[model samples]
Target: SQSADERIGTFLNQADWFGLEKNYPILKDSMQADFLKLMSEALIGYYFNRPDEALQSIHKLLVNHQAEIGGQNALNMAILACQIDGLKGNYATAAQNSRSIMEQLKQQSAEQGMYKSLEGICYFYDQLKNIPAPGITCPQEDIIIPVDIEKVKLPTSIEPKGWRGTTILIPVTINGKTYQFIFDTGAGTSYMSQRMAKETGVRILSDSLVINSNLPGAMTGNFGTLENMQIGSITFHNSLITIAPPNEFDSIMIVDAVLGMDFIGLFDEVRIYPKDKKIVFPKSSTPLPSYGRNLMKVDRALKLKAQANGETLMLHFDTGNSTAGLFYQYYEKHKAEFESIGKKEKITGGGFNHVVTKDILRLPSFDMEIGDATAHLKNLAVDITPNGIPAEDDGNIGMDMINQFDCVTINLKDMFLKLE
Candidate 1:
């Protein structure tokens, strides 16, 4: 017989379909270390295109071992379950579980820093953070119109004080007709709902697109490119956008398009006055804030030597991930030591759910040295696998590590992680 990892890897290689359908009920008898390693391998295999084995192994884990896993692993498993439900055309249950998992994750976390990865599902995080606060009185009424689209006008005004939001209107043409679209700074990418796309008679290439969408509850879907997209006075031709289907959401009736960072980078500055519902797009002579100035710095991807288990691992400085987590590879390499230490059940994860009552192992805190600054982190969640990550780093330094500081910044262009 193969080693535990090899056996699980082999089992995953032979399985079919990745949703809730494949039943690997044997995982119920697995200890935490074995269970986590198996789950991680299955998910990694699935994402990498070994769907058959991935599905079988994941199905076994979900059906027999859900209660033992928590944090990112738990959330990932829940999302897979929802996907399975969706595949079976059980949308109600799919949506329900999807919502439940998100809600549970939110409730379970104690800090605002930790958020469920699934928040992108229904565009939840985007809506929450982007919705301009109401009740602002503008000094004067401003005329707003779409750049290329005709017969589209919106009233604009400025707020006296407080956080002012900027509005950008993009002009789009569909079948010889033109329309103005809203450009949201809070949105991660450009998008148009199916209903709006249909009503406007816009010709969409397809319903599927590969997008790093930040919208809560959003999935990988089909996207198309526009011949020409214009915002205010600036114009961009051959712009790409993701077309969202009508079944995706229940609230907004209008087909709104988002002009996110990819397009926003073309401009220097954007200003918004929510009080007056006015937006101003202007070229600024002053340099915008650099990611380095705003984020904490990590000198490099460092190998974290777990004090308790004596295992070495790599970690990334990610402000994007709200919670701290261990990579699956690191967790697997130190499985024996982790299990020997037992679990830390009473620790509280920042969020509404407050208490993690399980006996999950608590990784001993160690000195995290970044640049010239260093801090001691104690009692981190351990014995858990870092699954479903968008990047290649083994673990992430989330708010759990960053919150101990005053501020953190990252300079994307320079490729440096900074801390202050």
Candidate 2:
């Protein structure tokens, strides 16, 4: 509240965005005077729990700018506008607008511009509408995925240096360029670092709006898409990619890209070979309820159900961190039981918002159960955390809990978590 935006305000007010609208003729005449202001108001509104207001502001920019100042040059802005619109049950309208733009582009035939935008519209419509197009799937490229690959042994290239569970760095080939990307089930969306995107000549979408924390206090990112993302043998024809800023003070190293749920969820099943440091795109399904096979619900995610003292909650199976954690909500819900058993202490952690002090409750009887293992963990705690995650998220199940299993398998096909 005090200094986050107070420092970044000047940068936003400064002239010259990362890319040139001159490069995009469509936006050549469109006005940019109130562009940032309108987009900001819309995004902030979305984040502040005002979906209806955000939707209207998005409509305002799309209709007004295309009419008053410009249209084609502001393609990125259009892309951003339609995306938010899609989220608010206006994807059909957004798709129509894009289709019309495609008609206009038929004459202009701008740099695969029409193609990218069509895919953009198709993507949200498919995801939000739950409509499938069979062979014309909107997200994937020109290839079909087969389940017959050998175990993909991950390289420990970044593990020794970066965040927890950093061993798995996969390759994502875009156009003709290739990059090492972090394969993380913990993250919900895939991201392309602005550093890598700029270097690869990927389109840099401007920060036209906000997605608010549902969850982050990290530096905000712009959204982009790679219509040609190659993962292993499969190619996600059109993958939504976040344009991440350079290494912030809080970020580990400058991560080139992250392959999150948006990508991994495409597979039938994903098997993690932690011991061998591998990831296998297995050929067939692994039947559940077998030894070490813990079936979990895919409610938003495959959460790890746990209990401490008397109360219980689910946690994100966060392979990103090795240490287990508890949300402050759980602490606040059962203050007496936690206080009587767990040791209270003041500690400082990397708050999602910033480096700040926090009150911690180190629970001795972690007595949380998951994957046939009830953890009476010694190295787990609950603290006052800045809200960046969804309100439903109770805590995180870290690597300490995952390491107990012989293997961890996520089956998107069956919507279950299998551990062995």
Candidate 3:
């Protein structure tokens, strides 16, 4: 086994050095420490041509540095190696090593406090997890999802790019007229645009207003709650929704309300069927799984259960967020409980470079009871600033609690959440 740097150097030495010198002048300064960086770059070049040499070079690196690499570098290298292995017909080793590399990257990201990057990786892993293994004999029942349960359809014709989940249209009746809303699992709570509020004749609750200045430079708006709203077959009469001024989301084209976690939490599981272009819900009687110690369980495709200020809330398990916790106006009402038990800390990064601090409160060990199932809440971090999108409800339950669950299912059709 050779180090990635040595293998890359060996291959580069055999190449047309004169042409290489003319193309990439910096390669002349390549050294031991620069091996990883150079190998990474050269691997990309190898991807275009020189398949045999690329396979040999990558194999050496994988065998040598598989254990030494960690964090983003490790994950990226492992992915490249896995791709090479797969292309070379080493399916077994590719799958095994790919899974191991992904797991290590996820764990490292979590330990290093890179929550946002962890979230993105979670999405990546989710896509990988669904890939069927080759030459593995498993029961067909285990691999096949029922057709009836998978018939739900997505409202919009467009789908999300890559592995990131996209918004699904949830049909709702507002003020007696039928409308479709974007069901954003990433959003902590459901929210309506000001125009939608006016059209639906829903009054804004003045006393429930909160000020949130932490938005993208392009987005500026005030926050308020909606007294009642209806979506799908469910009606949350006094449901709270945030209102964003017109100019805030001018770049976005959609006009309907956003269906967030608050509304989605009421059910056991929400299922979104990409093939059928519809949404389905699992009955409340369906046994939900607990959010246990396995942090890897909370992927982009899963539903998660979390607790804030003594209340159990369901959150779309999102790994792409840097923060650990987010809640809606409903959590604000219990500010005293959170203030007593939660601590305050400075949290930066929502697009601003300067350290933007927020009073972060923590909920020590608590119980998050969800539909007869309870997950032990441990070391939950809560951010008290209105940093979320104003057009959505409550804050998001980011990687903090999501990492605990064993499994999560989001049914887009019936708008149900299944946690295990």
Candidate 4:
């Protein structure tokens, strides 16, 4: 019994969906294992970029085991349901689910730690009813490749000399007017500032008080709807978007909005050529197949396998990030080694949320093995202080590391990242 529980715990901690799928059948029949199986199916669907399957799995879990689930498990199932609905662009349904969840939480004891976070979640999704179901009306054949480009001119504090990346900006048309948008895969949903939303004629559906990590001051803004958006002839009609309150950095960045995975994942494969300033959405009939190393979509971010100092590491592959660095989780694991041979420095980093400074331990040089390639880093810095980064990922491999290759292809259908 201990062995089985430990095995399942390890797989869950690692978010290893494949491992659970392979071994779950062997676990002896029990109520816990059955619930775990359903949850595993939900995760498998979500991480593999199949929202329909994930939605189905979530429904099955709730319907079959509703009475057996405890408080935390019940809350988790509802959260998963809302998340999947949002991914599938069923905004109104997601909003309704969150509203019901909030009502249910009100009856429970206030001692629950999850109640505070649920308040924010409810506020965030409540505006979804104002927007129609987000969908694309573009024909597969009409989709084009190589959209025009604009680059992020980073603040002086965050820039790295010859680092080779900041952000990839793409030409996007909103309501017949063209504007530049930063293509950010790390963001789950598309976002724009309040001023940009007003300029684009986005109707402010609702407002929410927001709190972003490490950013001082509470932020507030409208959740609105984009009536039409076009990218390289592919048009998405009636999309729901976040209208974030304006910040100091809004004036500094050239892009007006962020192009998140909500739109990017519509295609089976999206190809990128950073050096050439190209973004390609291959037609279904003439697909550019992906073959090479595999990467898993953990939540909205891509996670790839890497090796450093003879140990395996899981790193987030983020195109939105300008540089590659280790998180506090990595530093904690090798605290003794780093403290013995590391130099300390303070670095300033921030984004759409706001800015913050962190103490970092700088390693002279670092080398990591990723798939068939080896990544060499000079003066690599590890965050010694905890930031908002999740502990599940050892570190991040940003555009700075990815730009070394000539072309990068991402396949949502098969879940792979091919580099050449």
Candidate 5:
């Protein structure tokens, strides 16, 4: 029992993943092994983009604890199941699952033994209960198209005043009308302006509050659906779209739309060329020798393994923005190293609803080990984000680092990345 407790502690306190991979199997023979194994497997599947498998794992946990369905433990597992459904773009299932939890909580409250923590669970489900799940279909053949990089020079929070960095902007056609869409992997889902949505006549399925990290408050938006979208030669059908108010981004260079990982993940391999201004997609990627580290789908985010100053970090491979900085979680762990640097600066970031300023520790430059190569970051910013909210990843890897490479090929099917 003592040995099992130590192993459980290690599993729960893992620095990088939900648990060390090796430790999961070893604990199968321990107390409540079935519960621990199922819980660990659920997270492993969700983090690795196997949402269907994750859902199944969580289902077992719910079944095992059927007697305490309204308890905090069961409700927490229920929430995780809904989140896993969202990862696979099964918004309808997610909505249904959350609704089921709310109904059970209501019934339990009227009876007895209702936990106070269940109120927060009820609120989260209420927020997610109305999202529509739109079906998405990908191309059947390889599609290659030249993207616009010259026009890709856009302003960002880091480079707020001038057009300094480049990012791929693709031409996407919705309802037979073509529009420019920024190829932003940072956004978890596709979004279009209210003006464009009305012009293209995308069907608004439901209304919801959009909570943005950059903004202090939530913005109202509609969940819309695009019947079809044409990129290269092939067409994608029944894809989900977010319709945001046109004026929400009046301060920035507003595009017709933005493409997120949900749409990009449909293809097996997405080959990006920053200098050449081209993006290629293959229906099924040909096998290539592994040249880079694992690229994981952690919830709606794409995470890449990295190291800075000997500390392992999971950085979001976000192409929507230009700058990269460590979050507060990273700073709290290495507070001494940063305080000794003794340099502080304030940075302003403008986004969906407002402008936010945060304190940062600046470094002239630093080196990061990503995969097998070392990348240079000039004028690095540490602890850039405010500590108001919990940090998701250790840091974000943006276009500033990505543009340094000539080409980047991401395989969503195999979940790997290759830089050239």
Candidate 6:
């Protein structure tokens, strides 16, 4: 029998089939299969910057196949429904749906083995809705500048700034002013410093409320808008800029803004040349995660299929993070399976620069296969609970090995990655 996380893993595997329906053009005699297919397509819109279409697609599936889509699948959709509603600023609805999901899980956990681990889900929800982030709040009524896709160049190099060996920040001009912005595909929306807004005499244009979509349980950030942020000759106005607390950044003393999926996904292709230390905005219909798996988008971060020490699981691909480690939960379960022979080392992780030493279980080597590409490394450390991060997935893949690639390509339209 599969554990709860394992079962959820399977559902996650089936939740990325937007254009894949044509792959199965013939109708098979089963509502379960088709319902899952719709669920897959439903999530595609979020990555493509279309929450309304995403919500509609999922709603259509649930409404038409309500009778057939019960149990775990229903819960999966419910969790996503909360995400859609929250993005729409329908918080009350999102709250209720999220609560319903919890209640259902409470009952199911007692009755079904598949839902045995409900604590992570419960813990995260409490953190997202119940706790206020370390920041002030506001809403805005501003405008946005559309990406000028026509004159776009393929494989354009952007030397971004940053706090780590792998992560990078880009220089952007907002309304004739310059600031450094983190280019984070891991983050769904862009963010700005509330303190900076005050310091530079920048007025609030609009508002939004968001949490880290990956974990969906990080401290809530009060978001708003800024005007005319320019990047590589491309200008974006009315961008959803998150107003986070001061000292939110760990490595850099100053981070003026963040460039997230809202703008990043506009390009047909995004190539990350870690060694070259530049972010390439390439426009090609045929781009893939050149170094990873199918490149499924989960909780805003595009994920990849991977295996560690022969144990298979999915990992969140976070360019925002600089370190590589295993999930606390995953480490605890698979501790004995790994070989231990070296001195234990500790690593710190958290958003607010807090100390987070991993419960060390350093292995001389860590080998795993990521999609079609194979990854091998040494001094593998395990952090049972990496602070300021979400509590799912086997782990997050950081720059430890990604830097080895010529570049990793991401094309949201195709929803795939190729390791070149």
lDDT of 6 by residue, 1-420 (tens): 754334333645665333333232233222335565566556555544456767887888777877787755666676677676654445456656666666766665542455433333334333334322222111221222222111111121211222334456666775567766667776665666667666545444323333444433233445445545666556665454556666634333344566776566555566666656666654335534344225666555677667665777677777665546666777767656653453465543455434333446666777887667677756666664444555767777766666667767666666666555
Q: Which is the winner by TM-score between candidate 1 and candidate 4?
A: 4
Please give, for residues 1-420, the per-residue lDDT of candidate 1 as tens digits.
444445444555564212211233443244346565657556543333233455566767777676776656655665665554332224455556667766766676732454444544423322222222111122232324323211222222211232111233456445456666654333334566656555654445444322433321233364444554444344554344556654422221233555543343333333333333334443322232332112211211222212222333346543223346565665667688666664655322221112222334566764555544565656555535444355444565554554455433223322233444
Ranking by lDDT: 4, 5, 6, 2, 3, 1
Worst 10 residues of 3 by lDDT: 292-301
Clashes of each: 56, 15, 43, 0, 0, 22
Tens-digit lDDT track of model 2 for 138-222: 3333232222212222223423333332235666677677777766566555666667777766544346434333211112446
Q: How far is candidate 4 from the true structure (C-alpha RMSD, Å)?
A: 4.4
Relative to the true structure, how large is the alpha-carbon lDDT of every model? 0.43, 0.52, 0.45, 0.69, 0.66, 0.55
Highest lDDT model number: 4
- Relative to the unseen true structure, what is the C-alpha lDDT of residue 213 in candidate 1, on a scale of 0 to 100? 31
The TM-score measured for candidate 2 stands at 0.55
Candidate 3 lDDT, tens digit per residue, 1-420? 765456445655664322332334354444465435445444533433233455565666656665655445545555665555443334455557656665765665553554333333333223323232221112222222222111122223221321212234566666678766666555544566778777877555332222323110111232234444554444554344556555422422334476654455444445444445555554533332343211111111234434544664445455334224546454476678778887665433332122243556666855555433465656566656565445233344443333345444553322234455
Tell me the TM-score of each prediction against the true structure: 0.32, 0.55, 0.33, 0.81, 0.81, 0.65
For model 4, the stretches where C-alpha displacement exceeds 4 angstroms are 1-10, 13-15, 21-34, 67-72, 108-113, 141-144, 147-164, 212-220, 250-255, 284-294, 336-344, 362-364, 388-390
Who is ahead in TM-score, 3 or 6? 6
For 49-112, candidate 4 gives per-residue lDDT tens digits of 7778778878888888876767577678778778677657676787788778777777776525
